[PDB]
Subunit: 251 residues, 4 copies
C-alpha cells in the first residue's frame, strides 16, 4: 500500500507544494487547512483526478486553546480514517505577523495564534502521530533559517520558531526508539507575503546571495521530500536550511 502524509496549512503556497510533491512521490495526503476551504477542496480534487482516493481535506483551527489537543488528535485521526496509516507529518501551518514589544488582536490572542500554530500544534500533532503508531515514519517541521537574525518586532513569531527547533530536537531524541525521525526545513525567503508590495519583495530578493531571489515553494518541498525519503533514513534532529545563503549575510 501507498504511504500517507498529513500536511498542515496545505491549501496554498509551501504546504500545497509539499502536498503535491509528496503526492507525485506516491503518498496519499491529508490536506489540512483552516480558512482556505475553496483552495483545499480544489487541491484535493486535482490530486484525486490524478489518482482516485488519494487526497482528503481536514479543517482545523490551530490556534492554542483547551481544544487544540482534540483538534490535533483529529487531524491524525483523519489520516487513519481515510487511509489506514500515517507515515509522514509535515508541520507547515504558520501564523506570521508583527507583535511589537513597545505599543485588533489581544496579546493573548497573539500568543495563542503565534505560539499555537508555530509550536504548540506541532507538539500536539507529534504526540498524536507518535501515539497512533502500531516503513519509514518521519516528521518534518517548517522552521525558519532566520531564527537567530529575527525581523524587527516579530518576538512572538520568533519565539514560536525557536520552540519549533526545540521540539524538532526533543522529539527526534524521544521518538527515535520508535523509528520516527524528526527533522526541520528552514526557508530563508521563499514565497513572499501576498500583502507585500513588489518594491519590498525586491528588497528581500536583493539580500539572497544565491541568485538574488526567493525560494520557489517547490525548492522547499524538495528538501521536505529528501527528508522523508529513504535517502534520509539515518537523518534525525537535523534542520536543513534552504535559504540561498541568506542567514550568512551580515547586516
Amino acid at each position: 500500500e501507498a504511504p500517507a502524509a498529513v500536511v498542515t496549512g496545505a491549501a496554498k503556497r509551501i504546504g500545497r507544494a509539499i502536498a503535491v510533491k509528496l503526492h507525485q512521490t506516491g503518498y496519499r495526503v491529508v490536506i489540512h487547512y483552516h480558512n482556505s476551504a475553496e483552495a483545499a477542496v480544489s487541491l484535493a480534487d486535482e490530486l484525486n483526478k490524478e489518482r482516485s482516493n488519494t487526497a482528503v481535506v481536514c479543517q482545523a483551527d490551530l490556534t492554542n486553546s483547551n481544544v487544540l489537543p482534540a483538534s490535533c488528535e483529529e487531524i491524525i485521526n483523519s489520516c487513519f480514517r481515510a487511509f489506514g496509516r500515517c507515515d509522514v507529518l509535515v508541520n507547515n501551518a504558520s501564523a506570521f505577523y508583527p507583535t511589537p514589544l513597545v505599543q485588533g488582536k489581544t496579546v493573548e490572542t497573539q500568543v495563542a495564534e503565534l505560539i499555537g500554530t508555530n509550536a504548540i500544534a506541532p507538539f500536539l500533532l507529534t504526540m498524536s502521530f507518535a501515539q497512533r503508531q502500531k516503513s519509514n515514519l518521519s516528521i518534518v517541521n517548517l522552521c525558519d533559517a532566520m531564527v537567530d537574525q529575527p525581523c524587527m518586532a516579530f518576538s512572538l513569531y520568533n519565539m514560536g520558531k525557536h520552540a519549533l527547533v526545540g521540539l524538532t530536537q526533543s522529539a527526534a531524541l524521544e521518538l527515535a526508539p520508535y523509528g520516527i525521525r524528526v527533522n526541520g526545513v528552514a526557508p530563508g525567503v521563499s514565497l513572499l507575503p501576498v500583502a507585500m508590495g513588489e518594491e519590498e519583495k525586491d528588497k528581500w530578493r536583493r539580500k539572497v546571495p544565491l541568485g538574488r531571489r526567493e525560494a520557489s515553494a517547490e525548492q522547499i518541498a524538495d528538501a521536505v521530500i529528501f527528508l522523508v525519503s529513504g535517502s534520509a533514513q539515518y537523518i534525525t534532529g537535523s534542520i536543513i536550511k534552504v535559504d540561498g545563503g541568506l542567514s550568512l549575510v551580515h547586516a
Copy 2:
C-alpha cells in the same frame, strides 16, 4: 537614587541568590513569588534589616492565562511603586517537569511550561519596556543543555528555546531604547529537591569542571556581570555557566 530590580521566582534557590547579590551590589529589589510567601517575606526581611525599605515582595502566578498580562504588568508596576524606577528585570521563574510525547492536562502543562518559561518573560519584557544616564537591562535564565535536551522534556525544552528567541528578538527591538537583553544558561546548578540523591551524583560526575553543580551564587555572578557597567556593550548574549557540561558527548 539606587537602581531597582525585579527578580521572578526569587524566594528560593537561584532567584534568591540573584536577589541577594543584586541587593549586595546596591539594588533595591522586588522579590516575586508564586507559592513561596513565607520564604519571600523572610528574604525581604533579611535584606531590609541590611538596608531599610530596599526589598519588597510581589505575588503572581506566571502560568499562561487571560490574566497573565495583567499579572506581569503588576509585577513591573510594583517595582515602580516601591522604588520609583525599574532598571533590571531578571526572568528567573520557571516550571520544570517531564511531558512525554507517548503517554495535569497537556494544556495546563503547556500553560505552565511555556507560560512561566517564555510567555510571562515576554509580557514582563513588554511591561518593563513600555514603562521606560541609565543602565537598563533584562537577564533571562536560560538552559545550557537546550541543544542536548533531557528525555521527555519537550515542552520545557520548547519554552527555553522560546526564551532564547525572546532574548534575541528583545535585544534587537529594545536596543534603540538602551535596554540590553541577555541570558544566563545554567547546566547543572542546584538540583530539583525531589530528585533522588544518586540521580544528583550521576549529573554531578558528568560536569568537566569539578564534577559538581554550580552553586546559585555562581549563577548569580553571571547575572551581576550582565546588569553592570562592565557589560554595557553586551546585548543578545547568553552566557553558559555550566562547567563545560554542554561540551560533553554521549
Copy 3:
C-alpha cells in the same frame, strides 16, 4: 562529455569511496583522489570503468599542509579538467583523525596533517575549483556533527573541522555569485576505525538514538548526492547532520 565530473578526495576507501560510487551511479565521471591507498583507488577506478568506460581516473596527492600544498590542490582540480573537460562537483572528504593531547610525530606535523587535510587542503581545492569555473556546480565538505561536543584530546582535529564549517559558510557566500553552492554533510558515528574492537564499537553504537548503530558510508553518500542534485539548487551554506540524533544526546 555532456556527463558532469566530480573530484572526491580520499575516495579510495570507506566514506569517499561510497561517495565516488554513488556519484558515478548518478552519472558522474569521477576523479578518485587518494594519498597512500593506491591499490584500492585503482581498483575502484577499474570497477567504475568496467561499468562505463572513461569515467574514472585516480589522482595521488598528500593533503598535508606544506609549501607545495597549493600546487598539489591545483593539480587535483586540473586533473579533473584534463580527464573530463569540466569539474562540476568537489567533495572535500579526505581527513586525518588522531588525538593531539594538550598535556614519533612532532606537533608541527600534527598541525600540518590535521589542519592541512581537514581545512587548508579544502580551502585550496575550493580556490582552484572556483578559479577554473544547465550547469549545477557545488562543493560538499565532510564536516563532523560532533564538533561542539568534541572527543577528549582531539583539539587539532576539532579545530580543522570547525575551520571547515567556516570555509563552508565563507565559500558559500563568496561563490554564490558564480552559482557555486557550498554545503556540508556532518556524520556522527559512521564507518568506525578499521582496527577498533567490536566491544568499543558497540559503546559508540549504543549512543545513537536512531537504531543504536553507526551510519553506513552509503547513508553519508546519500546526503552528498542530495546536496549536489537538482533537488538542492537553493541550498547553500548548509550543513546536514547525518548522525541518527547522536549530537542531541547529553553526557
Copy 4:
C-alpha cells in the same frame, strides 16, 4: 603573591586595553608584540611606573611555521622567567585581511591567518597547560563568525578553529582547574587602514548605540572571565557586539 598574565598582540588596541585592565586588577603582565616594539616597551613603562616589576615585553612572530611551537613555548617561558607563574593567557594576536577565493603567497596568507588566529593559540594553550589559584585562558573570538565578511575565508576559518580550540581545550583542561573561554567582539576598534565613510557604515549597523565597542568594553568581558565571578564558566564564548550578530541582511 600577585598573579601573572600573558596577553598576545598587547602593544596596541584591544590587547593593550586587556593588558591595562588586567594590570589594574592586580596582574603582572607579559606584553607580547610582533612588530610594535615602541608601543610595547612604552606600555610596559607606563605599567612598571605604576607598580615596578609588573610588566615585561616578549617579541614573537606568531605566523605558522616549524618554529611556531618554540616561539609559543618561549612566550609562556618568558612569563615564568619574569614572574615565577602564569595564571592567565589571553589569545588576542590576530592577522586580519582579505584572501579572496577567486601581495603575499597563499602559503603566507595561510601561515599568517591560521597561524595567529588558531595555531598559535593552540600552541600557547599547550605550553601554558604544560607548565602547570584561578587559572584560565581567554580567546579573542569573533561574533560575526557565522555571518562572515566577503573574501575573508582564511580569517574566518581561523576564528572558527579558535571556537573549536576554546571548546576542546575547555573540555580537556577542566580536570586541571584551567578554564578556557572566548570573548567575541563584533565591531570594536575598526582597522586603521579603513577610511571614515566605511567605519561609519559599520557603526550604523550596531543596534546598541550605533557605535563600535571601545577596547575597554571588550577588556571588561576578559576581566569577568578571568575573575572569581566566572569560576564555573568554561567553554563559553561571550559576544560583546552591541547586538550586531542579530541584524539580518
